[PDB]
């Protein structure tokens, strides 16, 4: 029943044109196939597949479908009046409740029937009638989802057959697409016949229900909301022009199936358009027969080049080659195929010629004649899609392509063509209609770039389809605007990816840049389901008229297989983007709150994520959204107030930095603060490096006992921009310690659809194995009890140590988190027990050691007013009585030394002293820098000599050379006592010398042996004289024999008494 391709074609023409909700789509469904078709013609849909495989319908089955189609008929056609009735009165509660009920009725009946229309065994010949039962269901399905809530159905109704609705598209999908490629497996594929029968198969199929099953998706009135307008670009071949009877005539003389395959089918290509044929003639001399010996195609591409092809069979020249520039779609061919008959004497059989004598092309304006006219005509197979014009404007398909095919052998020469067409809706120009949802399939671009492929469509899209298996470019395209080009449009893509990508669209530069999410498991099929749309983009402007699109997929900052189907675009003005903006932002807050009333934050939020939630409503539109935007506004300030107060940090925004001695935040002074950049919208903190590892680069403050609850989780967080070699603590029982490297990240280079610096250089809010790769950071600290009278808190501190470390970091943090269960409470409970146990140990050997260095403090002064030093003081006492007021523990915090401990007080008193007493020792010296701490000023140095420093508090002279002297002259009080006093070392061989004479005589002198740059030693010997000038001036000379002589310190001190 070959009324059915009559019948499929006519259809598809309405559904291309007039895919619009309402009475007039219905009237048409009605008027093109359901008030037309009664059971006879039902019956011609069946046998026009159960002739090609040779196989009829069970009888039970078959009478059964065709009743089935009949009371769908019926059924329908009482919806449509009821549906009219109401269209026309829509606020008449009878009208109202007839269509309700016509609804159910018919909805009821297809899920009911559409089972028997795809019984097991029959699936293939039953499948045209199952395409019309699928495509009226999703019709009906539709008009409850659109005017259900007007009919008087209730919104979880209407949503309920929504979900059916979008469930059936991709169900009915996928049975035509998957029985169609099961018809064509099940046939045998090895004589010409069998390729007969196979390509009529695939050819009455695609027309009958291919074709109409790519419409489905446009019944999604939700992704839908405007008329679409839907182009199919799958090739269709006709009937080999070879004459041939399989009743009469031997197989033998055609070409194989595998041939014919191999041959006369084109692989997958860009849609492309017939330019010129030059065919070549050939004969044979017996009888002298002529007929189309070989040929060549130019064909074009949309908005590209010409493509041509090599000569198809021979260039024969028995007749000149004839050169048909069409000019215009060829919409016709009468061909004349023959078989001619060559006596041979008995008993060998006739010689069999087999070839094509003549064509005539058809376009609308022009006939072409290859020789002559014949009677085979293209409108038998590909009839008119509309039949109330003449053909020359009613043709359903066009002529795209002829291939070539040839066997030859004993006694027989057999030539044919095929010619292949595309459909009508298929236009020759890629138009944007402002008044439609416009589909582009990426197969009518003229470029495909290197490593993507045209693939054959898996059967449900209306065509072919682009991969690439890795990121580059797919295609570029030419559109043509009707509109003016400072119209706005947005444009998104039907797809299927088992990877996250990235998708640029340039014009013209970089227009669209838009996420691609997974659809599909690596390895899955592509069936409907895999097959999703994106959001509609950006509004873009062309740049010119026609303009060129690339299409470029990116890493989204190699997996699986992206397929591209097409691009679709709509007008942005037909679109609601602003309230899509607002409805997204109210999201993002909605997710602040712990519950709908809005009044607790989540623990989660971090601070961080409300300043970007903050930027999300900060963009949306002054000019739409005014009222709206200002309330979320509030919400989103709120939330952040919220962090604010759960912030136990003080001073979180570092407006107050070395401010207060004992409270905020204390930092080294090359610390700097800036208002925001890039990353940060609020102040934020560099830390430099350090040129000494002594003197670090910090940051730290104590958050106070009274802040903190019992046996709770506490953490910190925060945002760090960059870092290098960053360490972070906190501190209570215990430290914990980590060391955070946190590489930069890219704004400027990665390709921007938006710029990321505005006017000014301001920041545009509104633009989108060891190493710590995640800015955010987190660390915790569990409390125990809590005592205010101890008032450990917690220390939180940054560090960098290196030259070449460096931070910036923000939004910081610190905040309860949790109470304590199970492991984590019992391993608080031993760390407090641990630390109060060590600290009772500190306190008992803190009294020992202090009493010891109190003691040996003391001594050294004549009494407890600190302000005399003993006669018999010398530096070594002082020295060593510094060394016992060192071994007090824990006076300062060996994470941070600037940061006092528990014994901060008892050091401090007592290294003053050391302090007093070093000052005293100086006062008294009648030598000047007789200690050498002001180096070697006021001496006089004769030869080589060194001053260096050694721990704790001393600087010492080396003499490493015995031709070396230091001397100086000294003022003294002619007969008065003083005494002479060497703090010293010998180091090898020989002696160190100190003399002091008179300029005539009364020399004295302390000597120094080794036997009782440099490492310096760790003890020194002390020897002292007295001394009775005459005169008022000695002097002191230092010097040794051989060998390295180490000198803290000469003193020359009056006896008072
Ligand atoms: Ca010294
Ligand atoms: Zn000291």
């Known amino acids: 029943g070959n009324s059915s391709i009559d019948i499929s074609l006519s259809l598809v023409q309405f559904l291309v044109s007039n895919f619009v909700p309402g009475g007039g789509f219905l009237v048409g469904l009605i008027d093109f196939v359901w008030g037309i078709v009664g059971p006879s013609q039902w019956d011609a849909f069946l046998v026009q597949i159960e002739q090609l495989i040779n196989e009829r319908i069970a009888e039970f089955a078959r009478n059964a479908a065709i009743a089935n189609l009949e009371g769908l008929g019926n059924n329908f056609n009482i919806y449509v009046e009821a549906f009219k009735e109401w269209e026309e009165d829509p606020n008449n509660p009878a009208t109202r409740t007839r269509v309700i009920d016509r609804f159910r009725i018919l909805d009821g009946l297809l899920e009911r029937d559409i089972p028997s229309f795809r019984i097991s065994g029959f699936e293939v010949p039953l499948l045209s009638v199952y395409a019309q039962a699928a495509n009226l269901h999703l019709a009906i399905l539709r008009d409850s989802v659109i005017f259900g809530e007007r009919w008087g159905l209730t919104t979880i109704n209407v949503n309920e057959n929504y979900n059916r609705l979008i469930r059936h598209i991709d169900e009915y999908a996928d049975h035509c697409a998957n029985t169609y490629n099961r018809g064509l497996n099940n046939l045998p594929k090895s004589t010409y016949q069998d390729w007969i029968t196979y390509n009529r198969l695939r050819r009455d199929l695609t027309l009958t229900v291919l074709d109409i099953a790519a419409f489905f998706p446009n019944y999604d009135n939700r992704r839908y909301p405007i008329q679409p307008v839907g182009q199919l670009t799958r090739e269709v071949y006709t009937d080999p022009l070879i004459n041939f009877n399989p009743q009469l005539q031997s197989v033998a003389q055609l070409p194989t199936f595998n041939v014919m395959e191999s041959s006369a089918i084109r692989n997958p ?57 069409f000019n215009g779609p060829v919409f016709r061919t009468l061909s004349n195929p023959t078989l001619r008959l060559l006596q041979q004497p008995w008993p060998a059989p006739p010689f069999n010629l087999r070839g094509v004598e003549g064509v005539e092309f058809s376009t609308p304006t022009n006939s072409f004649t290859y020789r002559g006219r014949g009677t085979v005509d293209s409108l038998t197979e590909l009839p008119p899609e509309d039949n109330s014009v003449p053909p020359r404007e009613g043709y359903s398909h066009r002529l795209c392509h002829a291939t070539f095919v040839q066997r030859s052998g004993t006694p027989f020469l057999t030539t044919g063509v095929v010619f292949s067409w595309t459909h009508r809706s298929a236009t020759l120009t890629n138009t944007i209609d402002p008044e439609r949802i416009n589909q582009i399939p990426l197969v009518k671009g003229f470029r495909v770039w290197g490593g993507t492929s045209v693939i054959t469509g898996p059967g449900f899209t209306g065509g072919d389809i682009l991969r690439r298996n890795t990121f580059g470019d797919f295609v ?57 749309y994106t959001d509609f983009s950006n509004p873009f402007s062309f740049r010119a008229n026609p303009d060129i699109i690339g299409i470029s997929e990116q890493p989204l900052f190699s997996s699986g297989e992206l397929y591209i189907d097409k691009i679709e675009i709509i007008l942005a003005d037909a679109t609601f983007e602003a309230e899509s903006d607002l409805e997204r932002a109210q999201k993002a807050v909605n997710a602040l709150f712990t519950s709908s009333n809005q009044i607790g934050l989540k623990t989660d939020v971090t601070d961080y994520h409300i300043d970007q939630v903050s930027n999300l409503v900060d963009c949306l539109s002054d000019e739409f959204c005014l009222d709206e935007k200002r309330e979320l506004s509030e919400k989103v300030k709120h939330a952040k107030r919220l962090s604010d107060e759960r912030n136990l940090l003080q001073d979180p925004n570092f407006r107050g930095i070395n401010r207060q001695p004992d409270r905020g935040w204390r930092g080294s002074t090359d610390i700097t603060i800036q208002g925001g950049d890039d990353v940060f919208k609020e102040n934020y903190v560099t830390l430099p490096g350090t040129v000494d590892e002594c003197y670090p680069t910090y940051l730290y403050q104590k958050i106070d006992e009274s802040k903190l609850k019992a046996y709770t989780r506490y953490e910190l967080r925060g945002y760090i921009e960059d870092s290098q070699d960053l360490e972070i603590y ?55 009890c809590t005592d205010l009278n101890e008032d450990l808190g917690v220390w939180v501190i940054f560090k960098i140590k290196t030259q070449d470390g460096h931070a910036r970091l923000g939004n910081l943090e610190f905040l309860e988190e949790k109470p304590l269960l199970g492991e984590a409470l019992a391993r608080v409970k031993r760390a407090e027990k641990k630390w109060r146990d060590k600290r009772e140990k500190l306190q008992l050997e803190t009294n020992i050691v202090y009493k010891e260095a109190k003691e040996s403090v003391d001594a050294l002064f004549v009494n407890s007013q600190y302000d005399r030093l003993q006669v018999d003081t010398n530096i070594a006492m002082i020295h060593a009585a510094d060394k016992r007021v060192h071994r007090i523990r824990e006076a300062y915090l060996p994470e941070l030394s600037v940061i006092p401990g528990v014994n901060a ?28 701490n002001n180096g070697l000023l006021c001496w006089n140095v004769k030869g080589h000599v060194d001053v260096e420093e050694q721990n704790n508090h001393r600087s010492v002279l080396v003499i490493p050379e015995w031709e070396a002297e230091v001397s100086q002259e000294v003022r003294v009080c002619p007969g008065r006592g003083y005494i002479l006093r060497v703090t010293a070392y010998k180091e090898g061989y020989g002696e160190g010398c100190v003399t002091i004479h008179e300029i005539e005589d009364n020399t004295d002198e302390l000597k120094f042996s080794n036997c009782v740059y440099t490492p310096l030693p760790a003890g020194y010997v002390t020897k002292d004289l007295e001394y009775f000038p005459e005169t008022d001036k000695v002097w002191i000379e230092i010097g040794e024999t051989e060998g390295t002589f180490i000198v803290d310190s000469v003193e020359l001190l009056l006896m008072e008494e």
């Open 476 to 532: 570029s395209l030419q559109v043509n605007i009707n509109s003016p080009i400072t119209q706005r449009y947005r444009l998104r893509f039907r797809y299927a990816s088992s990877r996250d990508a990235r998708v640029i669209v340039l014009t013209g530069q970089v227009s669209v840049n838009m996420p691609l999410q997974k659809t599909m498991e690596i390895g899955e099929n592509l069936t409907s389901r895999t097959f999703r």
């Open 905 to 932: 007080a008892i050091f401090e008193e007592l290294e003053g002293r050391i302090f007093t007493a070093y000052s005293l020792y100086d006062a008294r010296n009648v030598i000047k820098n007789g200690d050498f």
């Open 269 to 325: 290509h860009l849609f492309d358009i017939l330019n010129n044929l030059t065919i070549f003639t050939d004969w044979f001399s017996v009888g002298r027969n002529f007929y189309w010996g070989g040929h060549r195609v130019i064909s074009s591409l949309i908005g590209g080049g010409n493509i041509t092809s090599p000569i198809y069979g021979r260039e024969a020249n028995q007749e000149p080659p004839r050169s048909f520039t």
């Open 730 to 784: 906190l501190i209570r029982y215990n430290a914990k310690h980590e060391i955070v490297n946190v590489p930069g990240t890219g704004s400027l280079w990665p390709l921007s659809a938006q710029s990321p610096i505005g006017k000014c250089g301001e920041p545009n809010r509104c633009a989108p194995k060891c190493a710590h790769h995640s800015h955010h950071f987190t660390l915790d600290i569990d409390v125990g």
